[PDB]
Amino acid sequence: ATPPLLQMEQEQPFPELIRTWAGLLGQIGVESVRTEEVNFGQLAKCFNDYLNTVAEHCEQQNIWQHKREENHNFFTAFKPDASKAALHGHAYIAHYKESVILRHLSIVDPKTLGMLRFAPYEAPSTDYCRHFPDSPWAKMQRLATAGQNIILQLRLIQNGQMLEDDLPVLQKALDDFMQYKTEVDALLAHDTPVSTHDSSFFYDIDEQTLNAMSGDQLATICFEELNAPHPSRLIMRILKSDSLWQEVDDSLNGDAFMGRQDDICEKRNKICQWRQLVQ
Amino acid sequence: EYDYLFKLLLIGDSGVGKSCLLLRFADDTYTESYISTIGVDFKIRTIELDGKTIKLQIWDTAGQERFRTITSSYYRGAHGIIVVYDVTDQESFNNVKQWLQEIDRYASENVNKLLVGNKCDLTTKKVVDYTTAKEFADSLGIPFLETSAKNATNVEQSFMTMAAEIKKRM
Ligand SMILES: Nc1nc2c(ncn2[C@@H]2O[C@H](COP(=O)(O)OP(=O)(O)O)[C@@H](O)[C@H]2O)c(=O)[nH]1
Numbered sequence A: 001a002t003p004p005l006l007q008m009e010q011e012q013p014f015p016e017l018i019r020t021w022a023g024l025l026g027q028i029g030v031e032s033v034r035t036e037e038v039n040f041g042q043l044a045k046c047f048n049d050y051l052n053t054v055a056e057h058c059e060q061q062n063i064w065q066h067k068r069e070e071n072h073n074f075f076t077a078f079k080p081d082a083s084k085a086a087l088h089g090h091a092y093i094a095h096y097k098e099s100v101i102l103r104h105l106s107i108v109d110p111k112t113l114g115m116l117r118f119a120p121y122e123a124p125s126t127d128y129c130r131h132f133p134d135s136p137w138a139k140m141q142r143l144a145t146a147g148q149n150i151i152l153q154l155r156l157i158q159n160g161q162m163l164e165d166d167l168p169v170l171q172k173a174l175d176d177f178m179q180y181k182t183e184v185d186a187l188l189a190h191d192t193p194v195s196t197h198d199s200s201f202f203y204d205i206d207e208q209t210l211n212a213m214s215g216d217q218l219a220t221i222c223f224e225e226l227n228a229p230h231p232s233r234l235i236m237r238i239l240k241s242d243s244l245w246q247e248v249d250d251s252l253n254g255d256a257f258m259g260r261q262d263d264i265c266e267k268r269n270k271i272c273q274w275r276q277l278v279q
Numbered sequence B: 001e002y003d004y005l006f007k008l009l010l011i012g013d014s015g016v017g018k019s020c021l022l023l024r025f026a027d028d029t030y031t032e033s034y035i036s037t038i039g040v041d042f043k044i045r046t047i048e049l050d051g052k053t054i055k056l057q058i059w060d061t062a063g064q065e066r067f068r069t070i071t072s073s074y075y076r077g078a079h080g081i082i083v084v085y086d087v088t089d090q091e092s093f094n095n096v097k098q099w100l101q102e103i104d105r106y107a108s109e110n111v112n113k114l115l116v117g118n119k120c121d122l123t124t125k126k127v128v129d130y131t132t133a134k135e136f137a138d139s140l141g142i143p144f145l146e147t148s149a150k151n152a153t154n155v156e157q158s159f160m161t162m163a164a165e166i167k168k169r170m
């Protein structure tokens, strides 16, 4: 029986790609697969784009049921002490938007094929999914994890060096993705238009809340804001602040962000070139 | 190609050092890259032991719950499992109870286990004393070691101890 060749499409989206592959592998007689022409970096961008579309859709419809007057995501109930220090390069910020957290905990790094760490929300996230295993959050994260596993099983199969090997795990990963997509697409379909706020990644943080933050918390915010194509009111607020900048500077000059992979040297440079701009 | 083939499992909380330990064993390097392992990863290391050539198929797992079903496949068929905690992280120590339960649930009944307290180079941040860990490990007939992936302490000894124990179970 001839093993089918997984190929990556002209510009087709992750879901179509999976639909395609699941079809090829469900064909009769197949008992192996050729992952030689699969570019894992491109597969990761492809999945990440889809995750981004989903996470964006969740925000627009406010599937999170976020009340306009809270400056915090719904994970707050599952986290104190709430250390204000950095945890594997990030500090807990209670003001993270749910869709950003969702993207953080599930985006596959095209270079390393791991996740860029977002440690302060791993436990509250897990805790949430336990109390609310049918929650929209739990469903999105589950679709997310499902997509990750497809890439995982392919990278595994793409290796060589083992016993045998063997496929049903891949087959399942593909079908589990489809299923979870069904539930996600169904949640999304129910349609209050979209509510906007005055920074990209966080709910509105007031001056008093912001002057209570540690340097690590503040630097975490700055590093996050640089992911946006335009300077934010929030990051400008912080860099404009003389007192806030002091905390930001001596955290930047620490060791808590050494291991960060989001172009940390370059971001530190942007932040400095932006303080000068603003004082 | 080999006399034996030992499947090894690294399990334990997120961020306690499983991927770092495995990197110190396989390549003798250490890096601080904040990258979380997704699902599983593996490495292969043929070692010679008491005259016999042993292949180590070592599985690095993810510690976070969404990946639990994905890692669980690897508990069955594992010859030895290393349960890892962070000596600066009381919670990750507490969770060793919960990891030993996943071993019951999914792994064979004769698996060799090893308890390992990582990041032991953080000496002023250590909240889990050696005695409390040792006593717990001893109560189970389970070996215990305090390792440092960063300063290369006991990392070799942990895997070689575990390979020796599995070989002895013949
Ligand atoms: N001081 C110290 N820090 C460590 C040690 N091992 C790991 N770390 C830190 O914890 C992180 C590594 O844990 P890692 O193995 O990658 O995560 P895991 O795969 O989920 O267990 C690194 O980024 C380090 O900052 C260690 O032996 N000593």
Ligand SMILES: [Mg+2]
Binding pocket: B015, B018, B019, B036, B037, B038, B060, B061, B062, B063
């Ligand atoms: Mg890991």
